[model samples]
Target: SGAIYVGNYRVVNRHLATHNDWANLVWEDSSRDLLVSSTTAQGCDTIARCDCQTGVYYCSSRRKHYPVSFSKPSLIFVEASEYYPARYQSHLMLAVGHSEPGDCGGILRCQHGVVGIVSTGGNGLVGFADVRDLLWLDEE
Candidate 1:
């Protein structure tokens, strides 16, 4: 599969139940590259990179050149047959990209999309797990 972006949804920091946010992105995977780019904030200087690691989740954008303000815990793989109810996953796949108000100034959404919630103490969470289909990227 590929990257996906669910729109008009409330994404709360897993660490903070009180905090909620929203986001939009053109989710896609490229055949020449194994990375997923998240173009947020109207395609300004803010862009997130999600590197696919194996068959699980993408790694966090904490690498040297990546330079993401926030860090994602991980993007779990919720099987197509198991993804439901907006709250549940089969396994803790891999880490992906991350973002915050300072990074993009909440422009991606109304609230701080990726902030440490007081409840979980900084673990990032997204209500709508946006995913893109990578199989298409393989097509010429």
Candidate 2:
């Protein structure tokens, strides 16, 4: 029901900020009608020093949570939703109707690649530009 941080907790300090630091990346495309930003969160060596480097939104799935072969955090596991064939308009479109809300605006990954960033959803759909196709993105 609320936000979750992976290996993290909410603790304020003298700076009125949380423990971990995050540097953000922002981009807006006028032609495509997109405004999106992501972040590079900080990490620490010692276990006690830092445990909350990244924030997460774990979307509940329509499919069952089946057991996996791998035990370690080796690879990502993503399931196809009701909108399995995600349509590509200006943004990679999907049907958010199947899963819980708030899964939109998260990263869309495929085969060790970031296919897109989820954006708006209405009329039982959500969308974002396919980053793999966006040759204009400033990689530098």
Candidate 3:
């Protein structure tokens, strides 16, 4: 499914960034359940531009086409409200694609034509910190 209600962060880390042919990419969400790692010069045309054509949900840099259709541990948020104006301030984003056993913490997973990235903070993004304010362990 899909959900994002970002309202907490003291440390939430996981960043392996790259775009254009995709690389070990996992953007930003700093604070808490520490896994601190970082990198991002902002590539792939300023952090991707969303995709999923036949399955729908396209956004060629806001050419627009989003009725929303992304299910599988989908919860990416970084739209801290700056009041959109300047070429869609901060250039909104919400990306997905992470397998090897799906869903949050279980090695993360989100797929459906795999193409997601919207920015406001952390060049390429993946940040979150409000699962009762952190304290997690799902290791096998």
Candidate 4:
């Protein structure tokens, strides 16, 4: 029972979205408020940060016309169990296309950072959630 939700947990690195501060791109969960969908596969930019309909995308750098980034490579997914964590399901891995509607959790850029974390997808395929195989970190 090392990290299976049994007691203490409070680590932060800036997380509070979906609908907060107000306006659009929703995220005000006290009950219901989440609407900030994304995915034209690969197309992003950064600019807004004071109107709620905010913005911030830095694929590190990807533009072979349409690469995809938050780091590199391509075809990444993770946002929420969008429902296929049947207990870690091979460290959560799937691909092959679209998976909108919130895209829960979010964060993909692998081989060096994140690695995976979405959750589940639709008929097109988009399940994620390896998160470096659940957890076992001790680097410095």
lDDT of each: 0.24, 0.31, 0.26, 0.30
- Model 4 scores what on Cα lDDT? 0.30
Clashes of each: 15, 2, 11, 13
Candidate 2 regions exceeding 4 Å error are 1-26, 30-33, 36-89, 95-101, 122-124, 136-138
Candidate number with greatest TM-score: 2
TM-score of 3: 0.17
lDDT of 2 at 47: 15
lDDT of 2: 0.31
RMSD of 1: 13.2
Model 2: how far residue 104 lies from native, Å: 2.9
* Model 1: per-residue Cα lDDT over 1-140, one tens digit each: 11222232222222221211212322322211122333333211211224322221222233222312333334433322221223333212222344222221121211212221111111353112222223332222
Provide the TM-score for each candidate, comma-separated. Answer: 0.20, 0.35, 0.17, 0.22
lDDT of 4 by residue, 4-121 (tens): 1111211111123323323322112211111122222332211111212111211112211111222212234333331322232333455544554455344444334434434455
Q: Of the candidates shown, which would achieve the greatest lDDT relative to the real structure?
A: 2
Q: What is the C-alpha local distance difference test score of candidate 3?
A: 0.26
RMSD per prediction, one decimal? 13.2, 13.3, 16.4, 16.7
